[PDB]
Specification:
Biosynthesis; biosynthetic protein; 18 helices; binds the ligand COC(=O)/C=C(\C)[C@@]12O[C@]13c1cc(O)c4c(c1N[C@H]2C#C/C=C\C#C[C@H]3O)C(=O)c1ccccc1C4=O; globular; 10-stranded mixed β-sheet; Tiancimycin; Natural Product
């Protein structure tokens, strides 16, 4: 493995020009700048691309202690600049007082040299796509790969987590900082592990929240999901079953689940299903629910949605705005393309299609909610380029001074087992905070858990870390322990 420090250093001498972020409503309130990075760090004098940065300066200059870099997006496919705006609105005031918060879109999406390939709306849901039948899905996923191959072949070798880690080093140098702090979620926690593994002597304080397993790269991210999807759905069903009076879905978790399964039975046989006046298909009937289950505070929304698919017409106004937020528009395309490129650019997927059919059929039986969608054939199996570098070896020689891991005990897409594995791999420099009785993605600061907020703030502000892993309770749990 090679760091390519010479090429990184070559681009660290930049001094970006910051101005108000005036060209996008969600970013008003922030400054914006552009940076150049090489496409290929083995070819520093070759082709380059531009990254879009945003910043919110420390509100108390006399107390400023450094830069807090936000990992470039939570779930892979999402924009880091938009995450930074969200965080500026919800981080503790004292964190905002002492840190310049800097965020960025990683290479190939958003404000950072976006790549689009003509993907149709259905194609942008390739990750959670539920198959008609296996032969149809082979063709569906192969054709997704075909579009990216045709329109982006020349940059696909350079879509990797290690290159984003080098990009982070360029940002750090450009900001003029010897050390930076880091806050990351989901894919941002894999990037945080990689960047600290490669360059962690330059880390100050590091918080990773809702943790990618180090074992996942990258098909395990998919094949570990269905059991956690089933568990999260069942937890909601228990919550719904205690509320039959107000929801009308059933008085046992089995009955609520059968109500929902009846909606799946319908889309899985091209029988019409609508939520308000908006049609569901095999994928959306499951993905709308996955989207809700990313936070157990959405349980009421999900009751309204399932009720509206079974009987009703209208949804409650609140639910309509939240669903319109989340779906309403097509999934942002360049993020879909970058998500494909990274998942296949980091690591070579199996290419034998019989493996996927076997796995799809087994997972459809053991975990029906999302088994077939997660374990079956996916576009990286047909990818036109191999990885340019081996996967980073994460391990207890990680040079970061300290890493705090934050994890909701019942989170779905990044489960507690994944955080525990990351803790084992990173070794004694890391500590794990588990938040009990909480099925939520991105705990600090978004959930408002007093215990997590207090412990993370004490680390970021004062450098306090517990002596060993700790648990904190949820004082307002959606269901009993
Ligand atoms: C790569 O590191 C991670 O830990 C990533 C994840 C746990 C996920 O980001 C991933 C998702 C990919 C999507 O395409 C998602 C979503 C992702 N969430 C995480 C997941 C998962 C399981 C397979 C995957 C993946 C990642 O690309 C997602 O939650 C959605 C919710 C509601 C609307 C749409 C979606 C999506 O389309």
């Amino acid at each position: 493995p090679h760091l390519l420090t010479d090429a990184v250093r070559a681009f660290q001498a930049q001094s970006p020009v910051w101005r108000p972020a005036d060209d996008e409503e969600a970013l008003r309130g922030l400054e914006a700048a552009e940076l150049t990075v090489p496409l290929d760090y083995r070819a520093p004098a070759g082709r380059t691309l531009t990254l879009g940065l945003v910043r919110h300066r420390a509100t108390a200059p006399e107390r400023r202690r450094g830069v807090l870099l936000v990992g470039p997006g939570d779930d892979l496919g999402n924009r880091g600049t938009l995450l930074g705006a969200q965080l500026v609105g919800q981080l503790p005031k004292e964190v905002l007082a002492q840190y310049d918060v800097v965020a960025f879109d990683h290479r190939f999406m958003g404000r950072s040299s976006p790549v689009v390939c003509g993907l149709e709306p259905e194609e942008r849901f390739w990750v959670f796509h539920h198959p008609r039948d296996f032969d149809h899905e082979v063709r569906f996923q192969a054709n997704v790969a075909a579009k990216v191959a045709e329109h982006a072949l020349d940059i696909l070798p350079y879509a990797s987590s290690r290159n984003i880690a080098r990009d982070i080093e360029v940002i750090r140098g450009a900001l003029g900082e010897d050390r930076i702090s880091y806050l990351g979620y989901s894919y941002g926690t894999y990037l945080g592990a990689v960047w600290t593994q490669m360059f962690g002597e330059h880390a100050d304080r590091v918080v990773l929240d809702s943790i990618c397993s180090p074992d996942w790269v990258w098909r395990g991210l998919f094949t570990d999901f269905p059991p956690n999807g089933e568990r999260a759905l069942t937890r909601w069903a228990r919550w719904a079953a205690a509320r039959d009076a107000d929801l009308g879905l059933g008085a046992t978790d089995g009955a609520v689940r059968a109500a929902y399964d009846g909606v799946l039975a319908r889309v899985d046989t091209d029988r019409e299903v609508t939520v308000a006046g908006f049609p569901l298909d095999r994928t959306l009937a499951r993905l709308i629910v996955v989207g809700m289950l990313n936070s157990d505070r959405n349980y009421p929304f999900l009751g309204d949605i399932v009720r509206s698919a079974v009987h009703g017409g209208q949804l409650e106004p609140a639910t309509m705005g939240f669903l319109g937020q989340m779906f309403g528009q097509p999934k942002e395309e360049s993020g879909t393309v970058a998500q494909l490129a990274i998942l296949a650019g980091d690591w070579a997927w199996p290419r034998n299609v019989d493996l996927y059919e076997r796995d799809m059929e087994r997972a459809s039986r053991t975990h029906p909610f999302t088994g077939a969608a997660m374990a079956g054939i996916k576009a990286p199996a047909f990818w036109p380029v191999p990885p340019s570098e081996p996967v980073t070896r994460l391990g207890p020689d990680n040079p970061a001074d300290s890493i705090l891991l934050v994890q909701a005990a019942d989170d779905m897409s990044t489960p507690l087992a994944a955080a525990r594995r990351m803790r084992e791999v990173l070794g004694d420099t890391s500590r794990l905070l588990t938040v009990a009785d909480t099925a939520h993605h991105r705990v600090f600061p978004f959930y408002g858990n007093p215990g997590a907020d207090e412990l993370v703030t004490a680390y970021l502000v004062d450098g306090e870390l517990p002596a060993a892993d700790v648990t904190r309770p949820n004082p307002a749990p959606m269901v009993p322990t």
